[PDB]
Amino acid sequence: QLTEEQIAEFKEAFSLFDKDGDGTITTKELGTVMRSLGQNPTEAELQDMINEVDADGNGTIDFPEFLTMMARKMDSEEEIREAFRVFDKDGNGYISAAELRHVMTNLGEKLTDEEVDEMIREADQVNYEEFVQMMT
Amino acid sequence: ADQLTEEQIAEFKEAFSLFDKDGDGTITTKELGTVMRSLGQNPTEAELQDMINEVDADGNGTIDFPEFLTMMARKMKDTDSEEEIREAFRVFDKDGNGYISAAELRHVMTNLGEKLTDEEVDEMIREADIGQVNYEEFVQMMTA
Amino acid sequence: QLTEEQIAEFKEAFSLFDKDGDGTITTKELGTVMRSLGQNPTEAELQDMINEVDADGNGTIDFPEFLTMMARKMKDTDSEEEIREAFRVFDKDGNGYISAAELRHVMTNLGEKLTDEEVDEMIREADIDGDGQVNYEEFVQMMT
Amino acid sequence: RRQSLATKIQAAWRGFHWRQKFLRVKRSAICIQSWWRGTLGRRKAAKRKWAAQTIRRLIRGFILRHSPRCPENAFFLDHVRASFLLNLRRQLPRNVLDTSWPTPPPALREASELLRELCMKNMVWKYCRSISPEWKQQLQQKAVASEIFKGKKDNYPQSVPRLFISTRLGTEEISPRVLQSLGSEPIQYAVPVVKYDRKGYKPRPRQLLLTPSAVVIVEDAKVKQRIDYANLTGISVSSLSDSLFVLHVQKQKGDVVLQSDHVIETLTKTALSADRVNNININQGSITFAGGPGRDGIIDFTSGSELLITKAKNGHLAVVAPRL
């Protein structure tokens, strides 16, 4: 079990989304909390977590239960640049919005326009690396 | 409409009555200095002078008054102010009608920071509730 | 006669290769798609399927008929054993290996042939695993 | 058979090759798209941390609100500074007759009271210095008129919105023979009136001219009387929605009665020029005048449905007003 240093980081960002001091967190913001430390879960990693931790149907999570999940899942910035450059055709480290837009809306974690539209505003042909400076 | 009224007579007779009591002479920049120092600021002669010129109307003294006020509000060094506050509560608000819930708000001050303890601050919240709180009500009370 | 689970998966890839997104895709596309969904059709079967639906020479194929094709081909697909048997007749001496020369040879000539680009891709994939040559027994099961 | 069989092999490899290339693509995309949900997600947090900080900075500021300025109450203090100056700009007083000022934050009471005084003097100077001298005359004229009449005469109120003006009577109507006789005196105001004689109380149209020296009562060109301001003591009027008045004046003609269709105007304008402003009577009962010499007469006012002037065999002058 990791030294206290994480635990401090862990409790504050556990609490900060705890609605009114109870020690319980809604389902919807278990993701954001994790994200709020440096992670990158998917909705697959989430749902698998959710049912296993609680099948109560409560829609809550106390801090022991959240502690445990963390140890389990404990990737750098390069694991991102590969995951992006596969779509690049040129091999110049550029992809273009047209290309990127259609993919995201039809692949595994499909986005609605809202999420996607933020992408289009985000930068610039867009640049593969440019986003990563922002990305991380 | 748009016609002379007895009220206007009254306004004229009074205004000139006041005009006599007050100086014939125009408004002073050293008058203005007193007002800002009153508000906890302390500007130079150079800064005072500059201000008066950026508020003017045809008349003798005749400072534009509404837009004068607004000019000081910039000088605060905390422009964010009301904008910053109006936001910060909204992020702790589910329904965007201006309300917040007391356990929620209680959590914010007690837990995360340095253990701020209320004195009167507790008194105010219980007053705001009719139930939960209203920020607009909470702040207007706290500035008083 | 068709599972809901299946339609969901297939729709994804179709719509992914449906760049214009009209509800239909390039005939030349069609190969890459069925295979991306994990099948093993032959340009033999492609042409039969493409010719029949694209009777009218559109050069286009919609998703309703696409489900028949995946379903027709789903009816029968090659087990590992037959594929294992398939290599075995190019392996005169029953050691269970295959020179990557004989491999390159057999592939670039006999059947629905493969380029060097393709064949290099398959030899790397069918890796020598050391300077070696290509045990098919490990590899055939691998392609499943 | 070998050709048929060889195809199966190649058939499988392509399927394997594209399929694995596809999965690689799907995987590589679920990586970035949801790793990005955790970029945006990690800001939803850090802005909800700032929000908590700001609330608390404000309340920490409040608890310390009696402290000299410092980083902690700097927020709170600048908030009351800010809030105040805004909430005043919204609620500023409409004119010189708005006493009203809003209640301030305890600390800035001292500032509130500076500002209120400043605003008022600003308002006073702004107004007095921007008024056009034309207009300034009108209000000044109107103002004396209210002083004289407001409350005391049943048609002063209706008079107010209809402006006062220079002469009521014509470029040409004054008849050159009178102007010459009139002399080196000018005409500050003239207006058509109606005279009623001492004995008969009969109607006679005339013109009333106001010169710096005197009022002159003139027939078509014959100048039938001059009353000096020294020789004119007072004026008397009824208290009803009437239109008539008497000029008190001292073996020569004396007081006289007249009707202006513009009564308030004429009467103030006169009393100004003649400096007999304080010397106007407003009678609710009856008016006494010296009359045509040796023939004293009395004027009896009464309310009614119409305007008419007549005499009745008491010898008195019976006036009947309308009534709004």
Give the DSSP per-residue string, C60-91: EEEHHHHHHHHHHHHT----HHHHHHHHHTT-
For C12, counting Cβ atoms within 10 Å of its Cβ (0-12 exposed, 13-18 middle, 19+ buried), the class is middle
Q: In the 8-state DSSP scheme, what is residue B117?
A: -
Residues B74 and B125 in one domain: no
Task: Tell me if D34 and A79 make a contact (CB, 8 A cut-off).
Answer: no
Helices A4-15 + A63-73 axis angle, to 10? 120
C144 annotated binding-site participant: no
Cα D279 to Cα D150, D235, D242, distances in angstroms: 16, 7, 19
Chosen domain end from A75, A96, A125? A75
Number of domains in chain C: 2
A27 annotated binding-site participant: no
Task: Tell me if A18 and B107 make a contact (CB, 8 A cut-off).
Answer: yes
Interface of C with A (CB under 8 A): 12, 15-16, 18-19, 21
List residues in chain C that are followed by a break over 2.5 Å (C to N): none
Encoding tokens for residue D39?
Answer: 């970029």
Tell me which residue in A34, A35, A83 faces D32 most closely, judged by beta carbons. Answer: A83
For B117, counting Cβ atoms within 10 Å of its Cβ (0-12 exposed, 13-18 middle, 19+ buried), the class is exposed
Interstrand relation of D286-289 and D308-312 (parallel, antiparallel or unpaired) = unpaired
Encoding tokens for residue D250?
Answer: 């001292």
- What is the distance, to the nearest Å, from the Cα of residue D297 to the centroid of all Cα atoms in its chain? 44
* Cβ neighbour number for residue D26 with a 10 Å cutoff: 17
Inter-residue contact D208 to D173 (CB < 8 Å): no
- What is the distance, to the nearest Å, from the Cα of residue D268 to the centroid of all Cα atoms in its chain? 22
Nearest to D210 by CA among D145, D271, D139: D271
Residue of A nearest to C19 (CA): A102
Inter-residue contact B111 to A15 (CB < 8 Å): yes
**Residue holding tokens 């009108």?**
D138
Nearest to D163 by CA among B8, B11, B13: B8
End-to-end Cα spacing for chain D: 124
For B57, counting Cβ atoms within 10 Å of its Cβ (0-12 exposed, 13-18 middle, 19+ buried), the class is middle
Tell me which residue in A12, A15, A20 faces B104 most closely, judged by beta carbons. Answer: A20
Burial D258-285 (b: 16+ CB within 10 A, else e): bbbebbbbbbbbbbbbbebbeebebeee
Residues pairing with D227 in the sheet: D215
For D298, counting Cβ atoms within 10 Å of its Cβ (0-12 exposed, 13-18 middle, 19+ buried), the class is middle
- The neighbours of chain C, by the rule of 3 or more Cβ pairs under 8 Å, are A, D
Encoding tokens for residue C28?
Answer: 């030349």
Interstrand relation of D189-196 and D256-260 (parallel, antiparallel or unpaired) = antiparallel
Question: Cα(B32)–Cα(B49) distance, rounded to whole angstroms?
Answer: 9
Encoding tokens for residue A109?
Answer: 């974690």
End-to-end Cα spacing for chain A: 27
With beta carbons under 8 A apart, name residues in chain A contacting B104: 19-21
Residues pairing with D287 in the sheet: D299
What residues have CB less than 8 Å from D281, skipping those under 6 apart? D234, D235, D236, D237, D287
Encoding tokens for residue D9?
Answer: 């092999």
Residues B63 and B90 in one domain: no
Residues A133 and A117 in one domain: yes
Tell me which residue in D31, D46, D52 faces A83 most closely, judged by beta carbons. Answer: D31
Residues B50 and B98 in one domain: no
End-to-end Cα spacing for chain B: 43
Q: In the 8-state DSSP scheme, what is residue D220?
A: S
Residues A107 and A68 in one domain: no
Nearest to D34 by CA among A42, A75, A118: A42
Chosen domain end from B33, B62, B78? B78
D282 torsion bin: left (phi>0), alpha (psi -120 to 50), beta (else): beta
Encoding tokens for residue D16?
Answer: 């394997």
Amino acid at B66: P
Greatest Cα pair distance, chain C, in angstroms, is: 53
HSE-up of residue C58 (Cα within 13 Å, Cβ side): 13
Residues C68 and C126 in one domain: no
What residues have CB less than 8 Å from D134, skipping those under 6 apart? none
In angstroms, the separation between the Cα of residue D47 and the nearest Cα of chain B is 9
- Enclosing domain of residue C28: 1-75
With beta carbons under 8 A apart, name residues in chain D contacting B83: none
Residues A132 and A86 in one domain: yes
Residues B114 and B99 in one domain: yes
Burial D41-55 (b: 16+ CB within 10 A, else e): bbeebeebbebbebb
List residues in chain D that are followed by a break over 2.5 Å (C to N): 250
Residues A66 and A119 in one domain: no
With beta carbons under 8 A apart, name residues in chain A contacting C21: 102
Question: Cα(C20)–Cα(D210) distance, rounded to whole angstroms?
Answer: 95
In angstroms, the separation between the Cα of residue C70 and the nearest Cα of chain A is 20
Amino acid at A7: I
In angstroms, the separation between the Cα of residue D80 and the nearest Cα of chain A is 28
Q: In the 8-state DSSP scheme, what is residue D104?
A: -
In a mutational test of the D interface, the residue from A15, A26, A40 whose CB has the highest number of chain D CBs within 10 Å is A40
Residues C10 and C28 in one domain: yes
With beta carbons under 8 A apart, name residues in chain C contacting D17: 35, 121-122, 125
Chosen domain end from C32, C51, C75? C75
Task: Tell me if D120 and B19 make a contact (CB, 8 A cut-off).
Answer: no
Report how this structure was experimentally obtained: X-ray
What residues have CB less than 8 Å from A49, skipping those under 6 apart? A30, A41, A69
Residues A70 and A100 in one domain: no
Inter-residue contact D78 to D86 (CB < 8 Å): no
Nearest to D82 by CA among B84, B70, B54, B41: B70
Question: Cα(A124)–Cα(A122) distance, rounded to whole angstroms?
Answer: 7
Question: Cα(D249)–Cα(D228) distance, rounded to whole angstroms?
Answer: 9
Q: In the 8-state DSSP scheme, what is residue A50?
A: H
Interface of A with D (CB under 8 A): 13, 16-17, 31-36, 38-43, 79-80, 82-84, 86-87, 103-104, 107-109, 111, 115, 118, 135
**Residue holding tokens 């009608």?**
B97
Inter-residue contact D33 to A111 (CB < 8 Å): yes
Q: Is D251 helix (H, G, I), strand (E, B) or coil?
A: coil
Residues A47 and A6 in one domain: yes
